[PDB]
Ligand binder design. Structure first.
Ligand code: V7Y
Length: 832
């Protein structure tokens, strides 16, 4: 049908890539995946409740933390209901449900309760203590305001109708680069499984000309019958240095042995998740290529010391290497290992995947999954089984099975790095992709962030754009017409605003200070865009509950920075919004904001870890979406400046520094002395939290220009673009603490206490943090050495040490900060 053709046009515009484009492929795996994803999409579409789906209540099953219980000593909670511009307060027990509040509301004086100024609803049979909006109002000491609205028409989510024993041999023909010190170049063929090179052959070294020819059969030691599914033929081009790489799945999505002629366009090197992609470089014009031929196809006692050695192995951290003896022990006593869910990553990383019968034994082992299936959900282990070291279908399938039991709250907590983990899938259609599709189609918020996460990569990396676009298209074909409309207008808005950001950046030279003519130009462009081209309103991508409307063109500016970010402020389209404050958005080009996304998501995961132990470090992981190559959006935190400007105002701008300035700023920006006390408390907590987080992630040695503070004392690092010091604990922070280099005021003692507590809390989830850090590096960083870079978070988390030594370690970090002072801060200016 032609309507379906226009609809595919629409989907392509939304995705930023055409999934029907068969130009850059050597098989039909992407199409097979588009076709296979139809079943789960339609299943979840038929299974989801229209009412709850449309109202998407953001709830949780976690208990209410201790610090938020300290805010409801009355066992009562006030809710301010607005029938129609007439507000009345109702007392509610934390256990009262939305329906209960209705049956009592009409007994104090069908419908639905919505959050004022937001597309959020308090619906469904959940104790209203478990509504995220209520927990937020409690955390920030705010009243819970609600509009009595009608249930959003469930019909608005309408969904359109869907419509043998032979050694493996590979002939290397040659390499061709259309245009390119010749030196020497050779080709290396690696049969790999999960980054584990099962075998390896090479060619002879030849001078590198724009065309090099071998026509040589490379025979590998592996028999064809031994090739495991998901095995990659990894072709690399060296010259000591690795110049090019590319990959081909030896077994396809049909269990068929790959066979025939292949001319693969390769990726150039500027370890790394990009080195695993099966996609070929779509730039057939400039990129190197290689020609290959495949002609080969149907798919009871245990001593004490040994059990102790085995448990020692099992107990070590995820980054602890496994000796050959360790692997042989794990494998010989594999049925004992199966009783310990934590031994699973190490047990399966001890499988000889290059042997067919060993893999069959491993599968028979996976059949004994009683202990694994009846074990509590350990996210660290699931992540470990989903990373780069596991290419087997069933191994990863068990991790996805464990993920299945997660609630939408935790799925949002881990969605970014699950999407990223999709990069470790050998095949486009995988249990992980299907699970992300399911959980996005089941919940509108998860689907919103899934759209934006998939699109951040689709429009930025050719390595995985095709796969992510297949998945995003599968999702869009089931999210519903309302969400398609929202996504369309969101994309249009962000594209206009990125146009403006780049066009303004062009108008300025290296000299930072922007001209007056450029202020005129920005005002002109914004007013021109506001009249007609800019839609009436749009959902804030990083906060899907907010609808932004008209531009406050008088408040829009551009920073006098090397990069020219745009500071835009919108009005809230929701007339029932309880305030008049503007929605702040920073549109920035020049930084890779995928790294910012990842660091922020790890920060949120750490906050949840701390909540599990009744701690609240008041971190502020502002919204942040990467929309394209070194371009994205950032949430504008209200009433926040930078420590740098707080120094510049009073101490001058010649690298000078004074210590009392922070406290004077907090007291002059504090209306009441009591609110200043509250601001100092918030400062201590947030500073401890950010010190701990920034040391754990190895990003603590920042410049005070990249550290901000709110007028209400809340501190927070920003711009994670990319003599040292473990973290930023400068003397101006200490003078707010109440210490003069040597003293130890009650607030500094509280700060040290909170630091040690949070640090040990993180050490409790050591494994999960290690795996998340490893995945973040592998999927979001430029280039990382597996040995050096990753193994920072082991020492940072002081692996293997008892809690006493870890406390002493973090306290000595604090003492290093105390000892150095402004050394690094001043050195930043010095090295101009
Ligand atoms: C500090 C910096 N970023 C934030 O403030 C911020 C926030 N509010 N949330 N958030 C969340 C994550 C990361 N960053 C943030 C910031 C960005 C910026 C982005 C675009 C345009 C402009 C501007 C301007 C301007 C024009 N004429 N004149 C006099 C000033 C700016 C700007 O001025 N500053 C800034 C610098 C020092 C002191 C105070 C403000």
């Amino acid at each position: 049908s032609e309507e379906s053709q226009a609809f595919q046009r629409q989907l392509t515009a939304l995705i930023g890539y055409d999934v029907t484009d068969v130009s850059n492929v050597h098989d039909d795996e992407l199409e097979f995946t588009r076709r296979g994803l139809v079943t789960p999409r339609m299943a979840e579409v038929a299974s989801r409740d229209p009412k709850l789906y449309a109202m998407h209540p953001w709830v949780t099953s976690k208990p209410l933390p201790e610090y938020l219980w300290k805010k409801i000593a009355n066992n009562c909670i006030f809710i301010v209901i607005h029938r129609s511009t007439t507000s009345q307060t109702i007392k509610v027990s934390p256990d009262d449900t939305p329906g209960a509040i209705l049956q009592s509301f009409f007994t104090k004086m069908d419908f639905v309760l919505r959050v004022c100024g937001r597309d959020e609803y308090l619906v469904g049979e959940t104790p209203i203590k478990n509504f995220q909006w209520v927990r937020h109002c409690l955390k920030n000491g705010e009243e819970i305001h609600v509009v009595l609205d009608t249930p959003p028409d469930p019909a608005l989510d309408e969904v359109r109708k869907e419509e043998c024993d032979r050694k493996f041999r590979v002939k290397i023909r040659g390499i061709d680069i259309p245009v390119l010190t010749d030196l020497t170049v050779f080709v290396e063929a690696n049969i790999q499984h999960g980054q584990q090179v099962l075998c390896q052959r090479r060619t002879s070294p030849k001078p590198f000309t724009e065309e090099v020819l071998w026509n040589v059969w490379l025979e590998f030691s592996i028999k064809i019958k031994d090739l495991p599914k998901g095995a990659l033929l990894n072709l690399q081009i060296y010259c000591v240095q690795l110049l090019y790489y590319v990959n081909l799945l030896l077994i396809d999505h049909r269990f068929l042995l790959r066979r025939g002629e292949y001319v693969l366009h390769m990726w150039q090197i500027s370890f790394n998740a990009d080195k695993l992609t099966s996609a070929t470089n779509p730039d057939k014009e400039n990129s190197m290529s290689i020609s290959i031929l495949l002609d080969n196809h149907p798919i009871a006692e245990m001593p004490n010391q040994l059990r102790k050695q085995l448990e020692a192995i099992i107990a070590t951290d995820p980054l602890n290497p496994l000796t050959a003896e360790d692997k042989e022990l794990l494998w010989h006593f594999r049925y004992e290992s199966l009783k310990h869910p934590k031994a699973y990553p190490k047990l399966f990383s001890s499988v000889k995947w290059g042997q067919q019968e060993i893999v069959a034994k491993t599968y028979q082992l996976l059949a004994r999954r009683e202990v694994w299936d009846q074990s509590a959900l350990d996210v660290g282990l699931t992540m470990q089984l989903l990373d780069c070291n596991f290419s087997d279908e069933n191994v990863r399938a068990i991790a996805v099975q464990k993920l299945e039991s997660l609630e939408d709250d935790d799925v949002l907590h881990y969605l970014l790095q699950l999407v990223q983990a999709v990069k470790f899938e050998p095949y486009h259609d995988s249990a992980l992709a299907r699970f992300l599709l399911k959980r996005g189609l089941r919940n509108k918020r998860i689907g919103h962030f899934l759209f934006w996460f998939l699109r951040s990569e689709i429009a930025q990396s050719r390595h995985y754009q095709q796969r992510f676009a297949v998945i995003l298209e599968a999702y869009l074909r089931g999210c519903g017409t309302a969400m398609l409309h929202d996504f369309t207008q969101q994309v249009q808005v962000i594209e206009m605003l990125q146009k403006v950001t780049l066009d303004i950046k062009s108008l300025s030279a290296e000299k930072y200070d922007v001209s007056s003519q450029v202020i005129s130009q920005l005002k002109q462009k914004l007013e021109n865009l506001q009249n007609s081209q800019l839609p009436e309103s749009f959902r804030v991508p990083y906060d899907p509950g907010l609808k932004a409307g008209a531009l406050a063109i008088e408040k829009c500016k551009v920073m006098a920075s090397k990069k020219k970010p745009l500071w835009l402020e919108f009005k809230c389209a929701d007339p029932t919004a309880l305030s008049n404050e503007t929605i702040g958005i920073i549109f920035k080009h020049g930084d890779d904001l995928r790294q910012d996304m990842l660091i922020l998501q790890i920060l949120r995961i750490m906050e949840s870890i701390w909540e599990t132990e009744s701690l609240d470090l008041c971190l502020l992981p502002y919204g942040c979406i990467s929309t394209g190559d070194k371009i994205g959006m950032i949430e504008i935190v209200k009433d926040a400046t930078t420590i740098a400007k707080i120094q510049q105002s009073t101490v001058g701008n010649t690298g000078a520094f004074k210590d009392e300035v922070l406290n004077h700023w907090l007291k002059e920006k504090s209306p009441t002395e009591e609110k200043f006390q509250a601001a100092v408390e918030r400062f201590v907590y947030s500073c401890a939290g950010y010190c701990v987080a920034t040391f754990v992630l190895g990003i603590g040695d920042r410049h005070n220009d990249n550290i901000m503070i709110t007028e209400t004392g809340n501190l927070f690092h920003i711009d994670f673009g990319h003599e040292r010091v473990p973290f930023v604990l400068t003397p101006d922070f200490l003078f707010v603490m109440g210490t003069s280099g040597k003293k130890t005021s009650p607030h500094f003692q509280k700060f040290q206490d909170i630091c040690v507590k949070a640090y040990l809390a993180l050490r409790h989830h050591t494994n999960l943090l290690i795996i998340l850090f490893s995945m973040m590096l592998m999927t979001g960083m430029p280039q990382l050495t597996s040995k050096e870079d990753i193994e920072y978070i082991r020492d940072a988390l002081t692996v293997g040490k008892n809690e006493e030594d870890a406390k002493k370690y973090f306290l000595d970090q604090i003492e290093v900060c105390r000892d150095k002072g402004w050394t690094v801060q001043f050195n930043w200016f010095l090295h101009l």
